[PDB]
Design a binder for these strands. Structure first.
Ligand SMILES: Nc1ncnc2c1ncn2[C@@H]1O[C@@H]2COP(=O)(O)O[C@H]2[C@H]1O
Ligand SMILES: Nc1ncnc2c1ncn2[C@@H]1O[C@@H]2COP(=O)(O)O[C@H]2[C@H]1O
Ligand SMILES: Nc1ncnc2c1ncn2[C@@H]1O[C@@H]2COP(=O)(O)O[C@H]2[C@H]1O
Lengths: 225, 225
DNA sequence: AAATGTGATCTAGGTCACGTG
DNA sequence: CACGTGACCTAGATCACATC
């Protein structure tokens, strides 16, 4: 049902899924509207959430007031755990793109599950490990890849994660306004659209509201390169 | 000498200082010249290193032949662990700007220490956590702060770490060529020099060889923000 | 009816070219 | 082989609209 998702939460991953099943239960869920601010920077938190449905964007804002988005999280993705490992104010903020079902847990609860099963620590370090990896890849493309090739690279990220295969090519219902993709890519609203214009101009992809159909993933991949 | 550092080291805040003195002992040191590629991208690794002296620079290169530097590490700084927690090729290369004395340790060796002492896993997660946090700050500044602002930010991030207190102001012997600062900042060699020019021009800092005597940290800071 | 398209400018900064100790 | 500092020249933000 929904332990189907949590099973793929990293932290469980492996770990006596018979355990997982009993544990979910202590855990109780929370529901959020589209656009709810789960938490914001500066505000202190000792609570981490695993997403069950919907999508959450992580972000930051400079004092000038411009935001960028770190990442898009979706089912089975867990977030807001840095202030669980390094206690302190949130460094970012979590808002909703959709209706979200999320399970929530605090720090004192976590150390319990970690105390009972070591292997979870193994797997958290693996998540963080992978996670920083993913982030260095980005900090790199900010430096090298141009706004176009980046938009192209993003579409791939999203497609893979949130993708589905319908007919002969895959579907991506990103649920992002282009404004969001822009700040998820570090660029201006407009200059990304044009990247997309051309992207669709070559018949590489089809734009359909908050989603996209992608015809030539080979060409798109090639271009982001 | 060798041991004063380890306590200041990361894996093991605390800890059981009784342990550190002995465990430090099994680890065998190894030395490297100024410019030794400890490891490079693609090549496998199961070994993480704590620096005991000198400085190593992490960074990447595109197929184009450009390259950027993720970070500069010094004494008591761990690196090369990501392929320990998240097994897989190196995502970066570690090179020396110095003569570096570093202690080395593999994955299996690490699981031992973890299995004996748990706290270590809490402390590793704290490290990574702090790291992703500091990385994000950087991804942000690529996006928003201008090259001059970043160079002035970096100079601080160096002082804070490899800095000392000479007379009334602080000395930083970065041991970096400007080309390196550039790529540590994600800008060209030249546009970084002139940034420095103006910085020193305003008497904010004095440049001598591979170091810098900072006069007005208040100005530089404001300036970088 | 806020989300989009798309052009007409402006500018930071990259690329060159070439100096210097 | 590290710095210095110019004289251009592309990428892209900014603004200015117009369409759903
Ligand atoms: N660059 C990033 N990539 C992925 N997740 C992040 C990133 N930055 C912050 N987060 C998550 O967002 C959370 C914000 O609050 P925390 O600091 O408690 O924990 C943070 C992480 O779980
Ligand atoms: N790995 C990196 N490669 C290139 N530039 C970086 C890197 N990390 C940080 N920077 C930039 O250099 C700036 C120095 O100051 P900050 O770290 O606060 O903000 C930093 C980023 O804008
Ligand atoms: N953003 C970063 N800042 C500082 N050090 C890093 C960063 N990213 C990776 N590293 C270190 O560089 C190492 C490269 O090899 P590993 O991936 O095995 O482990 C990595 C980390 O220890």
């Amino acid at each position: 049902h929904m332990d189907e998702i949590l099973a793929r939460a990293g932290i469980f991953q492996g770990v006596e899924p018979s355990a997982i099943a009993a544990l979910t239960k202590q855990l109780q869920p929370v529901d959020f509207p589209r656009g709810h601010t789960v938490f914001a920077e500066g505000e202190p938190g000792d609570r981490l959430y695993i997403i069950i449905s919907g999508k959450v964007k992580i972000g930051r804002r400079a004092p000038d007031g411009r935001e960028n988005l770190l990442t898009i999280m979706g089912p089975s993705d867990m977030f807001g755990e840095l202030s669980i490992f390094d206690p302190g104010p949130r460094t970012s903020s979590a808002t909703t793109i959709t209706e979200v079902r999320a399970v929530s847990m605090d720090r004192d609860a976590l150390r319990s599950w970690i105390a009972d099963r070591p292997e979870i620590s193994e797997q958290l370090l693996r998540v963080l490990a992978r996670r920083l990896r993913r982030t260095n890849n980005n900090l790199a493309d900010l430096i090298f890849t141009d706004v176009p090739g980046r938009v192209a690279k993003q579409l791939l990220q999203l497609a893979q994660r949130f993708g589905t295969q319908e007919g002969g090519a895959l579907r991506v219902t990103h649920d992002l306004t282009q404004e969001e993709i822009a700040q998820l890519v570090g660029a201006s609203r407009e200059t990304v659209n044009k990247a997309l214009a051309d992207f669709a101009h070559r018949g590489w992809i089809r734009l359909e509201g908050k989603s996209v159909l992608i015809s030539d993933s080979e060409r798109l991949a090639r271009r982001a390169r």
